[PDB]
Amino acid sequence: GKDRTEPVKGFHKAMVKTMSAALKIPHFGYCDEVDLTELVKLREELKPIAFARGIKLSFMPFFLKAASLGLLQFPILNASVDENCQNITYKASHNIGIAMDTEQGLIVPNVKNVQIRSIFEIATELNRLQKLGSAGQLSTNDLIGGTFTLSNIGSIGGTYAKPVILPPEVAIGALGTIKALPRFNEKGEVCKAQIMNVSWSADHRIIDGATVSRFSNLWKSYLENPAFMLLDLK
Amino acid sequence: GKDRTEPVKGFHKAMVKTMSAALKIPHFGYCDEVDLTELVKLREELKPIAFARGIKLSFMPFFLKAASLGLLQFPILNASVDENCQNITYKASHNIGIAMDTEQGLIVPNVKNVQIRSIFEIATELNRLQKLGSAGQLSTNDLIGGTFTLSNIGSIGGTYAKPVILPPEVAIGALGTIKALPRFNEKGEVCKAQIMNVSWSADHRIIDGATVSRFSNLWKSYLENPAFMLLDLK
Amino acid sequence: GKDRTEPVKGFHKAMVKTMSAALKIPHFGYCDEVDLTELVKLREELKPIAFARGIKLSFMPFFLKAASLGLLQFPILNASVDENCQNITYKASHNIGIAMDTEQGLIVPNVKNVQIRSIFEIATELNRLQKLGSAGQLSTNDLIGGTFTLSNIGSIGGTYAKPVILPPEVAIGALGTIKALPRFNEKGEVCKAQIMNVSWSADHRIIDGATVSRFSNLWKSYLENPAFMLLDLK
Amino acid sequence: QGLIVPNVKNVQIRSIFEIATELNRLQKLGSAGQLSTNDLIGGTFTLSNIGSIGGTYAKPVILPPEVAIGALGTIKALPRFNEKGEVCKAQIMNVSWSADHRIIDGATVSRFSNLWKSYLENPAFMLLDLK
Ligand SMILES: [Cl-]
Ligand SMILES: [Cl-]
Ligand SMILES: [Cl-]
Ligand SMILES: [Cl-]
């Protein structure tokens, strides 16, 4: 009825500080659309195997593994920079953060070493981080060491977005809602295509547009043609 | 054929300062598409009732009422924040600004108290502000006290945007051109759908992704299905 | 397979400076889609004539000429601003930059005086700049005096982007991938339309929303209706 | 020179692509009669791709002291019912296993076979557990 004023208190303090720190990073946005039809079908095919094994199989495990595969080719996107971008540290480990909101705000735990983990393992670690995350039970280790972040806004809504890079990282993707839209196939006939938008933000002080674009294409070729991931997995 | 220097003077100075103060806000962007097929139809129907009552009715009053509805559920989006973001003021009134550009620069009049006004009353207030706005006669009271802003860029053109938040507000939305596109219906058949793009920017220091996304979904559902708006109005 | 730290050195130092400088600019984003079906056709009929004169004709010359035609009508976009944005210098020459990444990232040579050059002249000049750029042999003068930049991200991939303005310029545009989509014609029939996205960033300290937008529609109208460009060419 | 059987080492930590690379290598060497001791030794299990020449089914001979071997026949397009019940082009291959029945029982080879098969009938199934 009247205006209420309140302290930003406690845990809400971290977001203020994280997001303010991101003012120092000149964001270059790059977006695309990804045709996820073959992926949607694929997820359906593996749904029963993963249920049998006790896991719920979402799309994220696929996005994560493709991102990682992509980071092998473009390792500069899995790097950090110092106070004034004097120096860059390339990080061997793909510790990929998953953005979450809680009643206490923004939390980003990461799956460690995605580069040596299978899609099934990634699914398992996601379930774990999510359960812990919703019980307020994430460890310090779950939160530190993140090298790269994906944010599935698409689980609530949206198409395109402009996500905020988390210092000290240099890049973040936001995934929008998967939507059936009319699109042409190779014969030029109108099909049902499952279309997802992706939006990357990159620190343009050390990531040029070709890097992020080509990374995006590789990420996207992997998801549009899942079998392509098969080639180099062991 | 020749270069020319000029001072930024007078009313142009104000835009320099607002936009410069916005640099302190870490902007998070979130976008969506909205099916306005029922609303376009609904609007054609109310046109003559408005014309009879002396009012040009556009889409904005609907966008305004629906924003105020969502803000009731997500009042943090109608809030303000202080010098270095240590206190939130949650603001009772929904003073929603309509961003206009004048032969004089950026001007943001608002509709006071949208939460206690009807679409028709909002339309009346919009007509008043346009009369005065395009004549250069907006008054101090019409300009001040804004809590939240929408910007109808699509009255000129466009799809998505990155609007710039007006301090000390925490969010702003931009609406694109309503435009007919091929889209699937429930039966999986190809229809004409009146599609509009929405682009929100929010102060990620105190507004997380889920809040802007859920707000946006709510706003969207009020517009995709105007019937829902019926339920709670008095 | 461990971390490697490294100095940002040599040429990459320039990208850090430029992009850091761009933080002082409150970027406003405006985006749209452009129907290039006629243009694509048009280019197909011209390739032969230009191949016959020893010039590869891409889309870029068209985009450049149209931008140029638009800047004649909206000259504030081809302007520069000083230290805390107190004076605007309107630039007579349209020296449009073409953002390129080399094996050393960001290089932005420009075509001098687009306002007085033919599309064929612009193609020619773009060809000169490619030859040089990929040989790492662009000269000083090729790189200075830029007044406005285009960045054709879509020659790799992409739909929308949030490009970074290059001080002391006040605007840049990014062009996405040209992609066949299902679109209604005037009869209300589903057609194959050759669609491209454009994303504009502008310094909202001195360029307002209506200015970017109307400039964009003009540019867009020149491309959707290439005949329109004839009217005032000499 | 007759029968020669090199093996790809430690397949379980290699990708399809590395395996392909090793095959081309062993194929090259084999042709030039240049295979090393180390290439020929230590095999634990054998495949014979008879269908690079011909055949459907086969009875391949186990290589002591291994306990199993698979022969692969020619991939042929054959008419087969789909999920509906309509005739389709199906790309059909035969596999014949021989197993030392002193220690390998019928369910084992068969259950092994099914697993292999479904990996190949639904290649996406392999995506799932590779690293
Ligand atoms: Cl920026
Ligand atoms: Cl679309
Ligand atoms: Cl930011
Ligand atoms: Cl900004």
From Swiss-Prot, chains A, B, C:
Tissue and organ distribution: Expressed in kidney (at protein level).
The organism's place on the tree of life at top rank: Eukaryota
Query: Which residues does this entry mark as bearing N6-acetyllysine?
Result: K2, K41, K47, K56, K187, K192
Which residues in this protein are found as N6-succinyllysine? K13, K41, K192
Q: Which locations, inside or outside the cell, does it occupy?
A: Mitochondrion matrix
Task: Using the record, list the residue span of the signal peptide; answer none if the entry has no such feature.
Answer: none
Specify which residues bind CoA according to the UniProt entry for this protein: R43, S58, D101, Q130, S151, N152, S155, G176, I178
Coiled coil spans: none
Q: Which residues form the active site?
A: H204, D208
What does this gene product do? The branched-chain alpha-keto dehydrogenase complex catalyzes the overall conversion of alpha-keto acids to acyl-CoA and CO(2). It contains multiple copies of three enzymatic components: branched-chain alpha-keto acid decarboxylase (E1), lipoamide acyltransferase (E2) and lipoamide dehydrogenase (E3). Within this complex, the catalytic function of this enzyme is to accept, and to transfer to coenzyme A, acyl groups that are generated by the branched-chain alpha-keto acid decarboxylase component.
Record's subunit section: Forms a 24-polypeptide structural core with octahedral symmetry that represents the E2 component of the branched-chain alpha-ketoacid dehydrogenase (BCKDH) complex. The BCKDH complex is composed of three major building blocks E1, E2 and E3. It is organized around E2, a 24-meric cubic core composed of DBT, to which are associated 6 to 12 copies of E1, and approximately 6 copies of the dehydrogenase E3, a DLD dimer.
| The family this protein is said to belong to | Belongs to the 2-oxoacid dehydrogenase family.
What is the protein's name according to its record?
A: Lipoamide acyltransferase component of branched-chain alpha-keto acid dehydrogenase complex, mitochondrial
UniProt organism field: Bos taurus
Q: Which gene encodes it?
A: DBT
